Amino acid sequence: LAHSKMVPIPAGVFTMGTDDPQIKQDGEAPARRVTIDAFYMDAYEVSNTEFEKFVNSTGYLTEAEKFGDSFVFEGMLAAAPWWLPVKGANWRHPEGPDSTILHRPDHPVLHVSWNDAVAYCTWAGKRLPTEAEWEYSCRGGLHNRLFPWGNKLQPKGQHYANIWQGEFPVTNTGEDGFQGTAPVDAFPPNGYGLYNIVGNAWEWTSDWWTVHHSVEETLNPKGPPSGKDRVKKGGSYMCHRSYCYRYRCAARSQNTPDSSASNLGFRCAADRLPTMDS
Numbered sequence: 001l002a003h004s005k006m007v008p009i010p011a012g013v014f015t016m017g018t019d020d021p022q023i024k025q026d027g028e029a030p031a032r033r034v035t036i037d038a039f040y041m042d043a044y045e046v047s048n049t050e051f052e053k054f055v056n057s058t059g060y061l062t063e064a065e066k067f068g069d070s071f072v073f074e075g076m077l078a079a080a081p082w083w084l085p086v087k088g089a090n091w092r093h094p095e096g097p098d099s100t101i102l103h104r105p106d107h108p109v110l111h112v113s114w115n116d117a118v119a120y121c122t123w124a125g126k127r128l129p130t131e132a133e134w135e136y137s138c139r140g141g142l143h144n145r146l147f148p149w150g151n152k153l154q155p156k157g158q159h160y161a162n163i164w165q166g167e168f169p170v171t172n173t174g175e176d177g178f179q180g181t182a183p184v185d186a187f188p189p190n191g192y193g194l195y196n197i198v199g200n201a202w203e204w205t206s207d208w209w210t211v212h213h214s215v216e217e218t219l220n221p222k223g224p225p226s227g228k229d230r231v232k233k234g235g236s237y238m239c240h241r242s243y244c245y246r247y248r249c250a251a252r253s254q255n256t257p258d259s260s261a262s263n264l265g266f267r268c269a270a271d272r273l274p275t276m277d278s
């Protein structure tokens with residue numbers, strides 16, 4: 001395994017957002033042309049094993065551990081009736097104190113806040129991606145498509161991401177092979193070599209959240225200078241067209257930076273390769 005490996009994301013200009021927004025309240029529109037300098041993106045969501053290396057090295061206690069609770073989706077035992085604050089839920093105990101990560105070391109780390117993610121990425125010699133970098137990377141070299149791979153959810157009759165199948169929230173059929181998370185290296189890569197960029201775990205980005213965007217062309221944009229919530233991208237194993245259609249590269253949501261949940265993780269980015277881990 002090389003679950004901290006990065007891929008080179010080429011310099012380019014791309015269309016961020018969409019003039020055909022599917023969730024208008026989220027500021028998916030307007031489409032705008034954005035120029036991105038070449039950089040590096042983690043191929044994988046940060047896994048439990050990789051996060052454990054960080055905690056072993058630094059002693060870091062995550063925010064959910066210090067607060068003593070985190071949000072867990074009821075279907076695997078608040079923003080919605082299916083989100084419950086569970087005492088003792090955290091990255092090591094993703095459904096609460098009687099759950100474990102021992103059987104899922106290669107799954108994405110969960111219950112990590114924005115601050116926890118920044119701490120990990122900086123320890124790794126990296127950083128969070130901006131929203132524009134994240135979306136450009138998600139799109140995988142394709143223009144104005146719904147998904148990293150194109151416009152069909154199941155191209156060639158194949159599942160390409162870990163989302164929900166069945167009637168949410170009562171029945172997840174696990175048709176795609178995974179009820180909860182999947183290993184970080186599951187499913188096909190996109191055109192840039194990224195795995196699970198849509199689905200699996202949601203992913204923090206560095207930007208403050210706003211829904212007000214201009215059509216002006218921009219260069220390496222960082223988002224607004226202030227805010228109260230940080231932007232997350234890409235959707236999760238819970239998403240379904242019927243209620244939360246956020247497994248599209250253009251989709252976007254937000255949470256306060258001290259937030260954490262059982263469907264929210266991250267990956268890192270870097271301007272240049274960090275020191276080789278000998």
Ligand SMILES: *[C@@H]1O[C@H](CO)[C@@H](O)[C@H](O)[C@H]1NC(C)=O
Pocket residue numbers: 049050052053056
């Ligand atoms: C973290 O440290 C513990 C205790 O030394 C060890 O058992 C475990 O394998 C370490 N985890 C990683 C990912 O190195």
Ligand SMILES: [Ca+2]
Pocket residue numbers: 162163164165174175176177178179180237
């Ligand atoms: Ca699934």
Ligand SMILES: [Ca+2]
Pocket residue numbers: 045196197198199200201202203234235
């Ligand atoms: Ca993901």
Ligand SMILES: [Cu+]
Pocket residue numbers: 235236238239240244245246247
């Ligand atoms: Cu969703």
